[PDB]
Amino acid sequence: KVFGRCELAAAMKRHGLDNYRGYSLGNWVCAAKFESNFNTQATNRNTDGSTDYGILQINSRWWCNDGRTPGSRNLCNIPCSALLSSDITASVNCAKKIVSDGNGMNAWVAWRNRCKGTDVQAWIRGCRL
Numbered sequence: 001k002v003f004g005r006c007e008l009a010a011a012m013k014r015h016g017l018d019n020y021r022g023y024s025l026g027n028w029v030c031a032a033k034f035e036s037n038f039n040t041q042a043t044n045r046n047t048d049g050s051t052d053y054g055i056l057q058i059n060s061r062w063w064c065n066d067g068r069t070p071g072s073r074n075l076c077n078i079p080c081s082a083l084l085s086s087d088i089t090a091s092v093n094c095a096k097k098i099v100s101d102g103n104g105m106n107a108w109v110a111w112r113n114r115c116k117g118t119d120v121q122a123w124i125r126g127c128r129l
């Protein structure tokens, strides 16, 4: 599923991501924009053999099981395929664990490089929230 900008903002808010760990909704929407372009089915292969899955490009190195990342962890206790669903529940629940791990949203490369410090409220501008 390719979410609209305001559509994703509403879904993230319902699942309690807004202001989660102090990160405003615009931060989360911006992260999803640059990680996946709002596409729940996005996947990308990393140099080490791990893969990033879904709207927030969550990495199998630490967070989910795909059966093809030797030595990796599954800290969200989920199959990576669950992060590709049209329903964002699994991705949100895992994102909550990730952002609580110590380094906040810096875990998302695209957030650090393209969202951090910018006018992130622009991403929820005009949305009915």
Ligand SMILES: CC(=O)N[C@@H]1[C@@H](O)[C@H](O[C@@H]2O[C@@H]([C@H](O)CO)[C@H](O)[C@H]2O)[C@@H](CO)O[C@@H]1O
Pocket (backbone or CB within 6 Å): 035, 044, 046, 047, 048, 050, 052, 056, 057, 058, 059, 061, 063, 098, 107, 108, 109, 110
């Ligand atoms: C929270 C999350 O999963 N973020 C991922 C990044 O982990 C991922 O960055 C890759 O992770 C490194 C190793 O694969 C794991 O140590 C790679 O060196 C690095 O490229 C990023 C890739 O675009 O996507 C999300 O931000």
Ligand SMILES: [Cl-]
Pocket (backbone or CB within 6 Å): 005, 033
């Ligand atoms: Cl957009």
Ligand SMILES: [Cl-]
Pocket (backbone or CB within 6 Å): 024, 025, 026, 027, 120, 121, 122, 124
């Ligand atoms: Cl915001």
Ligand SMILES: [Cl-]
Pocket (backbone or CB within 6 Å): 065, 066, 067, 068, 069, 070, 071, 072
């Ligand atoms: Cl594995």
Ligand SMILES: [Cl-]
Pocket (backbone or CB within 6 Å): 065, 066, 078, 079, 080
């Ligand atoms: Cl599994």
Ligand SMILES: [Cl-]
Pocket (backbone or CB within 6 Å): 011, 086, 087, 088, 089
């Ligand atoms: Cl949803």
Ligand SMILES: [Cl-]
Pocket (backbone or CB within 6 Å): 109, 110, 113, 114
């Ligand atoms: Cl980047």
